[PDB]
Design a protein around this ligand. Structure first.
Ligand SMILES: O=c1ccn([C@@H]2O[C@H](COP(=O)(O)OP(=O)(O)OP(=O)(O)O)[C@@H](O)[C@H]2O)c(=O)[nH]1
Ligand SMILES: [Mn+2]
Ligand SMILES: [Mn+2]
Ligand SMILES: [Mn+2]
Length: 321
């Protein structure tokens, strides 16, 4: 029910204050605080994002919510507590982790991502699916980024919320990220209400490239204008910012922004040039991709940009389309 949903949100927003205190003030949170500071987190940024620390006692959140008069089973359903199936006892889901609040589209805290700082697995532990937290719907930073997304008529999608935090601080405000999942149909429905222009800047690795191709292809099919920013090999936005700085990052992002079709063929360049079977198949694919582009202007430029990769004229490529 809506009443129960509000209770769950309250739990999250109240424990946030305790997590924040634990991180910034307490002895147990000292190492976690140092970790964040070494990753460039100022006191102001930590406070702004409401970042905290979950102690390792396994009953920190439990006792707090119990003291505040919340139903323990509801706290379990809210994904803040886990349940020992043997004795039906409850304990903290998040233990010895740095706690990043996950806010919904209305800016209410509906879940957490807890990062290890001692090299434990998994690196990030998220809230489970709950009535208020759904990974297929939530886009990190969306409530904060909405204004700039509308103003700039563009949304930029990153892989990690950490990248979003750093990108925002660097000056790139129209950024969001899924919680480690493939962009859903629901996400795309939400996004297209804000803008038709979506730029993908995933990590500069094989998985990032594969995700870019897959996500970009689906966005293109849905009638969105897709662009790609390709980071240097082995880097994500956070790593690029840490190595080159904020100004270099915002310049880089503004520099090479390619339409999806151009990025795609550039990735397939070597295979096309050596494999005649792949040549034919990718010429057909790229022809189909370009045909899907709603922008007549960018459709024409894509034709001019893609044609050289197949050693054909723009007129020849246009004919195939
Ligand atoms: O164990 C994991 C790892 C990743 N993820 C989800 O996948 C996204 C991309 O995972 P990454 O591992 O690329 O995140 P990152 O590099 O920004 O993390 P740091 O090492 O810099 O701290 C993350 O933002 C997270 O949402 C998890 O949920 N659990
Ligand atoms: Mn990756
Ligand atoms: Mn990354
Ligand atoms: Mn990273």
């Amino acid at each position: 029910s809506n009443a129960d949903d509000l209770q769950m949100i309250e739990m999250h927003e109240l424990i946030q204050e305790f997590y924040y205190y634990a991180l910034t003030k307490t002895v147990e949170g000292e190492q976690a605080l140092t970790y964040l500071q070494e990753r460039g987190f100022t006191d102001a940024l930590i406070k702004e994002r409401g970042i905290g620390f979950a102690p390792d006692s396994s009953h920190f959140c439990h006792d707090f919510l119990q003291k505040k008069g919340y139903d323990i089973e509801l706290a379990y359903e809210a994904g803040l507590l886990s349940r020992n199936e043997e004795n039906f006892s409850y304990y903290d889901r998040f233990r010895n982790r740095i706690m990043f609040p996950l806010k919904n589209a209305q800016g209410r805290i509906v879940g957490y991502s807890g990062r290890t700082y001692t090299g434990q697995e998994p690196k990030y532990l998220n809230s489970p699916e709950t009535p208020i937290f759904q990974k297929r719907k939530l886009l990190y930073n969306l409530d904060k980024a909405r204004k700039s997304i509308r103003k700039l008529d563009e949304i930029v999608l990153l892989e990690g919320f950490m990248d979003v935090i750093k990108s925002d601080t660097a000056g790139l405000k129209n950024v969001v990220a899924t919680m480690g999942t493939q962009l859903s149909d629901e996400h795309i429905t939400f996004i297209r209400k804000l803008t038709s222009n979506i730029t993908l800047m995933f990590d500069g690795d094989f998985a990032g490239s594969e995700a870019t191709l897959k996500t970009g292809q689906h966005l293109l099919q849905q009638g969105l204008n897709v662009f790609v920013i390709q980071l240097p090999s082995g880097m994500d936005p956070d790593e690029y910012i840490g190595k080159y700085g904020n100004d270099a990052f915002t310049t880089f992002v503004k520099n090479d922004k390619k339409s999806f079709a151009h990025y795609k063929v550039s990735i397939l360049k070597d295979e096309i040039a050596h494999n005649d079977l792949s040549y034919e198949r990718y010429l057909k694919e790229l022809s189909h991709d370009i045909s899907l582009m709603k922008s007549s202007i960018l459709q024409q430029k894509a034709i001019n940009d893609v044609a050289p990769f197949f050693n054909v004229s723009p007129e020849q490529l246009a004919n195939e389309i």
